Design a binder for this molecule. Structure first.
Ligand SMILES: CCCCCCCCCCCCCCCCCC(=O)OC[C@H](COP(=O)([O-])OCC(O)COP(=O)([O-])OC[C@@H](COC(=O)CCCCCCCCCCCCCCCCC)OC(=O)CCCCCCCCCCCCCCCCC)OC(=O)CCCCCCCCCCCCCCCCC
Ligand SMILES: CCCCCCCCCCCCCCCCCC(=O)OC[C@H](COP(=O)([O-])OCC(O)COP(=O)([O-])OC[C@@H](COC(=O)CCCCCCCCCCCCCCCCC)OC(=O)CCCCCCCCCCCCCCCCC)OC(=O)CCCCCCCCCCCCCCCCC
Ligand SMILES: CCCCCCCCCCCCCCCCCC(=O)OC[C@H](COP(=O)([O-])OCC(O)COP(=O)([O-])OC[C@@H](COC(=O)CCCCCCCCCCCCCCCCC)OC(=O)CCCCCCCCCCCCCCCCC)OC(=O)CCCCCCCCCCCCCCCCC
Ligand SMILES: CCCCCCCCCCCCCCCCCC(=O)OC[C@H](COP(=O)([O-])OCC(O)COP(=O)([O-])OC[C@@H](COC(=O)CCCCCCCCCCCCCCCCC)OC(=O)CCCCCCCCCCCCCCCCC)OC(=O)CCCCCCCCCCCCCCCCC
Ligand SMILES: CCCCCCCCCCCCCCCCCC(=O)OC[C@H](COP(=O)([O-])OCC[N+](C)(C)C)OC(=O)CCCCCCCCCCCCCCCCC
Ligand SMILES: CCCCCCCCCCCCCCCCCC(=O)OC[C@H](COP(=O)([O-])OCC[N+](C)(C)C)OC(=O)CCCCCCCCCCCCCCCCC
Ligand SMILES: CCCCCCCCCCCCCCCCCC(=O)OC[C@H](COP(=O)([O-])OCC[N+](C)(C)C)OC(=O)CCCCCCCCCCCCCCCCC
Ligand SMILES: CCCCCCCCCCCCCCCC(=O)OC[C@H](COP(=O)(O)O)OC(=O)CCCCCCCCCCCCCCC
Ligand SMILES: Nc1ncnc2c1ncn2[C@@H]1O[C@H](COP(=O)(O)OP(=O)(O)O)[C@@H](O)[C@H]1O
Lengths: 177, 136, 67, 102, 505, 125, 178, 125
């Protein structure tokens, strides 16, 4: 069973919910647990242990994914430099590419910093973005060998499902406007 | 989880994510910490009932999972702060669908409690989003 | 094996990790919990009987014990 | 492993070997002391197993009484004026009236 | 395509390598004890000492091969476990796979094995550095200390239990078990007479930190009755308890992993200890403390500023780098280099569980190998030239060209040339520190990589170069095959470990 | 313990409540009871047996190869070893050269097999 | 002690500090008995100064028995005295006595060095002759050697079996109603 | 500029020739030590000055209380003494910059809820 450590402070604690008054030095183990030690120590305390483990993994993968965006845009800049002569090179770079380079700066992507200082809201947004990409991939089942593991029956069922989905999408008419 | 479908989507399935309010996160975390006993009780009682009356020839095979009803109702009341009814059947229409999904996860599909807690927390979150100032 | 066959936890962990906790809690925790809940058991029984009856008691509703 | 008798026999054998090594005498000296040590170790360790299990059982039983002492000791340890406070008044009356069944 | 066969093979390999080592040790010890009335060497060709040496060496080597295989299995298992957890997004589906234990061998200490990348890196370091040190201590073990041939096997068993256990108490006990064998080695195997006092200094200095860590563990256990190392997620320590725990943990583990000002014992022990045991000490015995500090500080939530700890680490780095110049003793100079590298590694762990841990682990590995190389070179110099002082040693290259070449390439590797895990670790740490505090990063880099580097290189260059005109009748010949291949293997690891999978780094 | 079927009557509970708390199919109940929803205990046992056999084979091969190499290449100096091998018979030389390599290679191949999941039934297209 | 609707819950065993004190006393007595048995096995007149610790520089059994006994008295982790010291610190933490822990640690480290410094004197130029001569030969007592061996085994492996001893001591102390 | 006559407080060896030391600290070995016999076991006589230099620093000690501050240069000694505080204050200023910007701060981050780096998390039946 969890216990507590005797407190020395002489402050008074008010619990409006239970309508009682306590003293910090007089708290027992359970009262200390209820009043002190309750603070949160993770981005999403509402999630269970397994759910927060998944959240942590998705956050790590999202950080790596933003770093991959930065690496890809840098590689595209290198490709542009090699293919296009210096004349008109900056004229062509003053487009989507330069805006993306600036938008993927250090505050938005953690290149080599020890920690990406993100609020819990920012972590939730990154995990949601990763989950959106995962859903888009899983729609067509592109994650069998990479980013996933499945049995033979699961693979066959996924192939059939993706075939049906592709057929329905093809049969759908073009979007207006 | 925490993903909303796109109403006007070019393709069949598209989802946009959202972040729940800090008040909602605090409420869900506090209620889970306070009522975690009931979820473990639900798991253990489900296993116990399956063991006791799993066989078709068992006398109590027709009363399956009924004893878990008290645990489920107690968990619902603990999560909802004894408001919005004293039973799961009294769940509001906003969370009725999520409650049905949770029941299918737990008793029909017999999926892991890791999975079914997602639907139970979805019910709680739906109630909290519907009310807002009523729970806090 | 034999020396630790008394308890699933290892002997060193038993000797050091458990400080001040009752041996009733270390061994046979179910009996400890049931003794702790003795009165709550009868309260829950009365609540169940009343619920079967017309009356519904909200004071003891939280007492739904499984261990 | 699981047999305390066999564990004690092995302990006695190794104790005899270690004693021979420490005394610097050949390990074959006084051969009759090997079975003697094995038997003595097996018997004593078997008895110690039984005694440890008995002591654990009796300690578990005594803890029930010790809980009664703790509850009553806690009430008597209350500082002056706290025995009629809302946080202890009902328990104090329970222990001073309901349990006054002599 | 990942299947349960790989999972069970990984678990079985990890569990059974420990029992392989334990049974080898048990059989060797039984033979040693029951073959002779008195457990000392018989000075003849038919002594059991040859068999014991063979058994120890080629138990360590075979267990190292099996550890390579098991580490690769663990890497695959962990990568696929992460993929399984991350990939599935359906709410109904959840990864809940339960494994049933084998019925052949029991779980040692009734504990379920848990393995991590840092723990397995530490175990690999244990294997390799122990192999090098045992190869070194052959000339030291003679006729009354042969019983210490099993010291490195005991170290391997202790480290295996240390890194393959999910119990806080067993973790702490394994960490504390390392003192007795090391003290006995220093006391009974060190040729120099000052080793007697060096051993006492080592014992007292390390035991002060051991007591600090013991106080921290008592705080954790008494407050939280749990011991599983994972139930701490559901219990939060108050601010006062957390700050006390972090301070105690940091100071206690820095007593072992040398930090300023607690490195007097390290200098004394390195100077006055066996040349073969100093390799093991510097390479491995100062990194168990880092591993324990990482585990505890990542398990506990800490709400205090780490500026004080960072300042302590940087002060230690600066102190060691400045003092490098004034050391004419090669062994003491290498000890100061060890202090510097260990302080940098410790600084790498001052940001909780941030990305700095990867750089810290890589720097721990590279420092282990580099310190092993440097201490082995010092050992060769001392053994063939009967002195390890710059004033008495000069012009090594012109009489022992291979040794001089090894010294020069060791200096090049220590300089941190690109293409080496040393350079990679420096890059990680400095890239993080530049954004953390760029001016502090500049000061640290300047000091360590200029002033300390110059002080370190002065003595080694002066020893390697020159003209050995003194005592021409007593000059040595060259390195042996054993020494040459040890140096080559150190260089090969330092070079090729940069190609290890980047998933874990 | 008040959590039991005693005292429960289907009349008290509504039809929807009973349907909600109705037992699933017998196959689903058996899978849940035996914990074989995804993998079977026999599959676990077979995997464990294969793992133990592979570990034993790998360890034995490594030990045999290492000891054979040591004893064959630890007879003396270069000249002594060369002369001994020259006097060595043809088959003895063949075994001396091949035993250690074959043992180590078999161990490494057995190690590689587990990580390489070639025996997957989806190979098609 | 917690109250929930007049139901007292006690997760603390009051009869535990006395058990820990008894354990410490027993451990110290065992280690003292080990060292004194080592002394009694030899000639008593030799040992009269801390310098005379070198006189223990005799055959391996006596030498290492003395070394490990001194380490156990100091409180080195694997040995027996560490069990008592660690459990005392654990109980102090349980009772929330940080100042008592501090003073205990100061005393422990000072005493640890006090015990350790004698290992320096244990070093001797040659092998000592501290055994009494009987029938023209040194008298080695098999019974005392066996007792020292049992004490050495328990000193080395007390951690493994400490749970049983702790159970027995708590069982004995529980009879006290305090 | 450094000369022995005019150094005063920056000590160094005197340039004048001196007779060899009669007594000096020397190498000592543990009793019953096994000799090191690498490369034929050839030992040369050690130079007294070289041995004295080898063992001088280990035995050097301050003669009187407070000599450390005065020896060498007082300003450099005080700067070296105050170095840890300078480092700590620089770190605090850099942390001020970090706080006001939003970059990495000096704290024990707890992104993982006690989940160690690539640890194996499994359950058993
Ligand atoms: C499920 C369980 C699993 C767990 C395992 C648990 C079990 C663990 C134990 C396992 C072993 C079992 C042993 C059972 C018998 C134990 C009896 C007993 O009490 O033991 C202690 C007791 C000895 O203590 P002690 O002498 O009283 O102590 C004196 C103090 O030291 C004080 O010393 P002191 O200096 O004052 O005096 C020295 C001593 C000097 O004297 C001595 O040397 C002592 C005596 C030694 C010789 C004894 C005679 C041997 C020959 C005949 C044996 C009887 C017939 C056996 C029939 C077997 C048929 C199948 O002085 C005396 O003479 C005093 C003692 C007087 C004589 C006592 C006679 C006792 C006889 C006991 C017989 C036991 C077997 C009966 C079985 C019956 C079957 C129907 O008896 C013995 O140990 C007797 C010796 C037995 C071992 C002999 C070893 C050397 C010879 C080996 C030959 C091997 C050949 C075969 C090879 C096969 C492989 C290739
Ligand atoms: C003829 C005897 C043959 C014995 C065969 C082996 C059978 C078991 C031993 C039974 C002996 C019974 C009689 C007592 C004789 C010894 C006392 C004595 O004075 O004899 C003088 C007798 C004659 O005197 P002498 O030789 O002239 O004088 C030498 C002095 O004794 C100086 O000698 P020394 O320096 O060599 O002494 C050892 C030295 C240093 O000794 C060591 O360091 C022992 C290393 C053992 C290897 C395994 C360690 C693995 C560590 C992993 C981490 C675990 C963490 C757990 C958390 C809590 C912390 C432990 O001192 C210590 O032991 C102090 C450190 C203690 C560390 C505690 C380690 C606990 C590990 C528990 C076992 C783990 C098993 C896991 C696998 C199974 C899972 C189901 O001495 C001998 O003949 C040699 C005795 C040397 C020790 C023998 C035992 C070593 C091998 C142990 C293998 C089995 C594991 C241990 C558990 C055993 C059951 C409880
Ligand atoms: C984790 C920390 C743990 C710390 C442990 C601290 C203690 C460790 C060291 C001491 C332990 C006791 C060792 C045995 C006694 C010494 C004498 C002896 O037997 O050897 C001489 C004797 C040597 O015979 P020999 O060489 O053939 O001839 C000798 C002379 O020529 C001829 O000899 P003699 O004619 O002059 O005398 C022969 C007589 C000599 O025997 C004696 O006179 C024994 C002297 C000691 C008496 C005190 C024993 C108390 C035992 C209870 C536990 C407390 C132990 C306290 C120990 C330290 C106290 C300062 O031999 C016997 O009969 C030996 C029997 C020994 C067992 C006694 C059991 C008494 C139980 C009483 C209490 C029962 C519970 C009541 C509950 C109440 C509830 C209302 O040894 C043997 O025959 C066997 C030697 C090899 C196997 C030894 C097995 C020892 C097992 C110890 C178990 C300890 C408890 C369980 C573990 C607890 C922790 C988990
Ligand atoms: C807090 C506000 C700060 C901001 C405001 C602006 C800065 C104000 C700082 C204060 C400047 C005026 C006071 C300095 C007096 C000298 C130091 C002293 O007291 O030590 C005893 C002084 C030194 O004796 P000694 O070192 O034991 O004997 C050496 C012999 O010369 C034999 O030596 P050697 O021939 O072997 O050669 C060694 C020589 C050469 O040594 C070397 O080559 C090795 C490197 C030495 C260090 C060079 C300085 C590097 C930059 C320092 C950066 C510090 C940052 C951390 C502190 C930050 C604090 C804000 O070593 C020396 O440097 C010794 C000379 C004295 C130290 C000069 C350097 C450090 C002074 C403190 C600077 C503080 C700057 C703070 C601002 C930083 C920027 C934000 O003793 C004497 O009086 C003998 C004469 C020595 C030459 C004096 C030169 C004239 C100085 C001006 C005199 C008028 C002062 C009026 C004061 C008015 C009331 C407030
Ligand atoms: C129905 C019951 C029937 C029972 C029948 C009786 C069975 C008797 C069995 C006797 C076995 C004797 C084995 C001796 C082996 C000697 C090996 C050797 O040479 O080693 C020498 C070595 C070396 O000794 P050394 O010191 O002389 O060394 C010589 C070497 N130089 C020269 C270098 C010094 O020492 C030993 O190992 C001998 C001493 C130990 C002997 C241990 C014997 C254990 C016996 C256990 C019996 C258990 C029976 C259980 C019965 C249970 C019934 C329910
Ligand atoms: C209840 C069961 C208990 C089992 C106890 C196990 C008993 C172990 C006994 C060891 C005896 C060692 C000496 C044997 C005789 C050697 C004769 C010789 O030199 O001729 C050369 C012959 C053959 O040499 P070769 O020239 O043919 O070389 C090829 C070698 N083999 C056959 C191994 C491929 O014997 C040997 O070479 C055997 C060497 C044995 C020593 C090995 C030392 C390495 C470490 C292992 C030691 C054993 C521990 C257990 C295994 C490891 C842990 C799992
Ligand atoms: C470096 C010194 C020389 C080397 C030896 C090392 C010895 C010192 C080891 C570190 C000890 C901890 C120091 C930092 C403490 C930080 C927390 C703190 O006290 O702040 C007030 C803390 C934190 O307060 P707070 O203000 O942050 O929040 C709580 C505020 N109230 C209570 C009002 C609500 O306040 C306390 O609760 C007081 C705790 C004081 C504890 C001091 C004694 C510790 C005893 C155990 C360790 C003893 C080790 C001895 C080793 C041997 C020495 C020879
Ligand atoms: C050197 C060969 C290595 C082979 C790989 C597996 C090694 C496993 C560890 C063995 C340790 C030594 C024996 C211990 C015996 C003991 O007391 O063993 C005692 C225990 C008994 O366990 P329980 O009592 O709990 O049932 O043995 C075991 O648990 C299993 C022992 C190993 C079983 C496999 C044997 C393989 C034999 C290979 C023969 C060819 C080898 C050729 C080498 C050149
Ligand atoms: N250890 C030393 N300490 C101080 N000065 C030294 C030392 N060794 C040499 N010198 C200096 O070297 C010079 C003498 O050179 P040296 O090689 O000894 O030739 P010689 O003594 O024949 O003149 C002097 O200036 C002397 O001060």
């Amino acid at each position: 069973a969890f216990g507590g450590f005797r407190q020395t402070d002489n402050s008074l604690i008010i619990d409006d919910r239970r309508k009682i008054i306590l003293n910090t030095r007089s708290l027992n183990d359970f009262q200390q647990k209820i009043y002190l030690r309750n603070f949160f120590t993770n981005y999403r305390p509402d999630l269970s242990s397994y759910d927060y483990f998944a959240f942590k993994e998705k956050l790590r993968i999202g950080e790596l994914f933003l770093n991959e965006y930065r690496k890809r845009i840098n590689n595209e800049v290198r490709r542009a430099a090699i293919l296009t002569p210096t004349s008109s090179l900056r004229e062509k770079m003053n487009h989507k590419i330069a805006d993306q380079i600036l938008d993927l700066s250090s505050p938005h992507v953690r290149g080599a910093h020890f920690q990406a200082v993100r609020s819990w809201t920012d972590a939730s947004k990154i995990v949601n973005y990763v989950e959106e990409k995962q859903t888009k991939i899983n729609k067509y089942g592109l994650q069998f060998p990479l980013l996933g593991n499945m049995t033979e029956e699961q693979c066959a069922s996924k192939e059939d499902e993706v075939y049906q989905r592709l057929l329905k999408e093809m049969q759908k008419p073009p979007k207006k406007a | 989880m925490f993903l909303n479908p796109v109403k006007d989507s070019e393709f069949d399935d598209e989802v946009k994510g959202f972040v729940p309010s800090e008040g909602e996160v605090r409420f869900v975390a506090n209620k889970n910490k306070e009522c975690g006993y009931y979820l473990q009780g639900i798991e253990q009682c489900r296993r116990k009932m399956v063991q006791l009356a799993g066989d078709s020839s068992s006398q109590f095979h027709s009363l399956g999972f009924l004893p878990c009803k008290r645990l489920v109702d107690a968990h619902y009341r603990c999560m909802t702060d004894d408001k919005f009814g004293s039973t799961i059947e009294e769940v509001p229409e906003i969370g009725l669908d999520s409650a049905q999904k949770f029941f299918d996860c737990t008793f029909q599909q017999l999926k892991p409690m890791q999975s079914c807690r997602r639907f139970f927390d979805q019910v709680v979150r739906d109630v909290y989003r519907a009310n807002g100032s009523q729970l806090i | 094996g034999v020396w630790s066959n008394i308890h699933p936890t290892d002997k060193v962990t038993l000797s050091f990790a458990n400080i001040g906790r009752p041996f009733r809690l270390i061994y046979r925790p179910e009996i400890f919990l049931r003794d702790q809940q003795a009165k709550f058991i009868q309260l829950e029984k009365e609540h169940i009987e009343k619920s079967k009856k017309g009356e519904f008691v909200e004071t003891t509703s939280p007492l739904v014990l499984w261990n | 492993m699981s047999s305390m008798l066999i564990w004690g026999a092995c302990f006695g054998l190794f104790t005899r070997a270690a004693a021979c090594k420490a005394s610097m005498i050949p390990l074959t000296t006084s051969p009759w002391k090997y079975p003697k040590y094995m038997i003595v170790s097996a018997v004593t360790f078997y008895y110690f197993d039984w005694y440890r299990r008995m002591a654990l059982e009796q300690l578990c039983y005594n803890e029930e009484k010790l809980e009664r002492y703790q509850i009553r000791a806690k009430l008597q340890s209350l500082k002056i004026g706290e025995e009629l406070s809302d946080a202890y008044r009902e328990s104090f009356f329970e222990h001073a009236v309901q349990k006054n069944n002599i | 395509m990942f299947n349960l066969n790989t999972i069970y093979l990984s678990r079985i390999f990890i569990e059974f390598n420990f029992y392989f080592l334990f049974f080898l040790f048990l059989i060797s010890s039984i033979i040693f004890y029951f073959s002779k009335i008195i457990s000392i060497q018989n000075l003849n060709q038919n002594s059991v000492f040859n068999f014991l040496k063979l058994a120890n060496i080629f138990g360590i080597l075979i267990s190292f091969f099996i550890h390579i295989i098991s580490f690769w299995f663990y890497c695959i298992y962990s990568y696929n476990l992460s993929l399984n957890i991350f990939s599935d997004i359906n709410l109904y589906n959840s990864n809940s796979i339960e494994l049933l234990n084998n019925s052949l061998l029991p779980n040692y200490f009734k504990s379920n094995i848990t393995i991590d990348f840092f723990g397995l890196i530490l175990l690999t370091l244990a294997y390799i550095v122990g192999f090098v040190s045992i190869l070194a201590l052959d000339t030291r073990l003679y006729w009354k200390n042969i019983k210490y041939i099993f010291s490195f096997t005991i170290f391997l068993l202790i480290v295996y239990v240390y890194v393959t256990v999910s119990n806080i108490l067993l973790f702490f006990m394994c960490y504390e078990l390392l003192l007795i064998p090391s003290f006995l080695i220093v006391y009974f195997v060190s040729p120099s007479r000052r080793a007697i006092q060096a051993s006492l200094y080592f014992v007292i200095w390390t035991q002060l930190g051991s007591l600090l860590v013991l106080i921290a563990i008592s705080y954790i256990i008494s407050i939280t009755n749990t011991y599983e190392f994972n139930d701490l997620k559901y219990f939060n320590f108050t601010n006062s308890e957390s700050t006390i725990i972090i301070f105690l943990i940091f100071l206690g583990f820095g007593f072992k992993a040398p930090i300023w000002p607690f490195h007097y014992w390290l200098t004394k022990t390195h100077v006055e200890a066996p040349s073969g045991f100093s390799i093991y000490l510097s390479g491995f015995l100062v990194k168990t403390a880092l591993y324990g500090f990482y585990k505890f500080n990542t398990s506990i939530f800490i709400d205090i500023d780490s500026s004080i700890f960072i300042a302590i680490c940087i002060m230690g780095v600066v102190d060691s780098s400045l003092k490098m110049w004034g050391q004419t003793d090669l062994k003491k100079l290498v000890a100061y280099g060890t202090i510097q590298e260990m302080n940098i590694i410790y600084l790498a762990f001052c940001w909780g569980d941030s990305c700095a841990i990867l750089g810290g682990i890589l720097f721990s590995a590279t420092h282990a190998f580099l310190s092993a190389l440097m201490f082995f070179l010092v050992d060769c110099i001392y053994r063939r030239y009967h002195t390890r002082s710059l004033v008495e040693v000069n012009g090594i290259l012109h009489i022992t060209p291979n040794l001089g070449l090894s010294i020069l390439f060791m200096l090049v590797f220590f300089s941190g040339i690109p293409g080496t895990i040393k350079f990679i670790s420096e890059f990680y740490i400095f890239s993080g520190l530049l954004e953390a505090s760029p001016f502090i990063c500049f000061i640290l880099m300047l000091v360590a990589n200029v002033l300390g580097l110059i002080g370190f290189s002065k003595s080694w260059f002066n020893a390697t170069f020159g003209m050995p005109k003194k005592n021409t009748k007593y000059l040595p010949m060259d390195l042996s095959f054993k020494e040459s291949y040890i140096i080559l293997y150190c260089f090969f690891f330092l070079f090729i470990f940069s190609y290890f999978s980047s998933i874990f780094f | 313990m008040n959590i039991s079927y005693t005292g429960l009557k289907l009349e008290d509970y509504s039809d929807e409540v009973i349907r909600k708390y109705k037992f699933p199919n017998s196959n689903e109940l058996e899978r849940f009871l035996n914990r074989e929803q995804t993998l079977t205990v026999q599959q676990h046992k077979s995997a464990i047996k294969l793992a133990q056999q592979d570990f034993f084979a790998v360890a034995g091969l490594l030990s045999v190869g290492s000891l054979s190499y040591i004893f064959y290449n630890s007879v003396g100096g270069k000249v002594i070893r060369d002369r001994i091998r020259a006097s060595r018979t043809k088959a003895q030389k063949v075994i001396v050269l091949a035993l250690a390599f074959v043992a180590n290679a078999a161990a490494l191949i057995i190690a590689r097999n587990a990580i390489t999941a070639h025996n997957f039934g989806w190979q098609a297209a | 002690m917690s109250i929930f609707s007049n139901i007292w819950i006690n997760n603390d065993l009051n009869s535990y500090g006395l058990s820990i004190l008894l354990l410490n006393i027993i451990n110290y007595l065992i280690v003292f008995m080990l060292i004194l048995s080592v002394i009694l096995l030899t000639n008593l007149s030799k040992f009269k100064s801390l310098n005379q610790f070198k006189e223990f520089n005799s055959y391996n059994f006596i030498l290492y028995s003395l070394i490990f006994s001194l380490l156990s008295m100091a409180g080195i982790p694997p040995l027996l005295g560490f069990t008592g010291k660690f459990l005392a610190i654990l109980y102090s933490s349980f009772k929330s006595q940080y100042l008592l822990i501090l003073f205990m640690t100061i005393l422990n480290i000072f005493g640890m060095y006090f015990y350790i410094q004698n290992l320096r004197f244990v070093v001797k130029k040659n092998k000592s002759s501290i055994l009494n001569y009987k029938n023209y030969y040194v008298n080695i007592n098999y019974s005392i050697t066996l007792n020292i061996i049992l004490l050495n085994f328990f000193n080395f492996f007390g951690i493994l079996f400490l749970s049983d001893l702790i159970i027995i001591l708590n069982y004995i102390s529980s009879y006290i109603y305090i | 500029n450094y000369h022995y006559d005019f150094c005063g407080r920056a000590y160094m060896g005197n340039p004048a020739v001196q007779s060899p030391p009669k007594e000096f600290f020397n190498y000592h070995y543990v009793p019953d030590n096994y000799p090191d016999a690498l490369s034929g076991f050839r030992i040369a006589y050690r130079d007294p000055f070289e041995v004295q230099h080898v063992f001088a620093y280990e035995n050097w000690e301050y003669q009187y209380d407070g000599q450390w501050w005065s020896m060498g240069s007082l300003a450099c000694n005080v700067l070296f003494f105050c170095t840890p505080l300078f480092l700590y204050l620089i770190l605090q200023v850099e942390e001020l910059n970090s706080e006001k910007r939003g970059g990495t701060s000096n704290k024990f981050y707890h992104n993982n809820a006690g989940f160690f780096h690539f640890q194996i998390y499994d359950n058993k039946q």
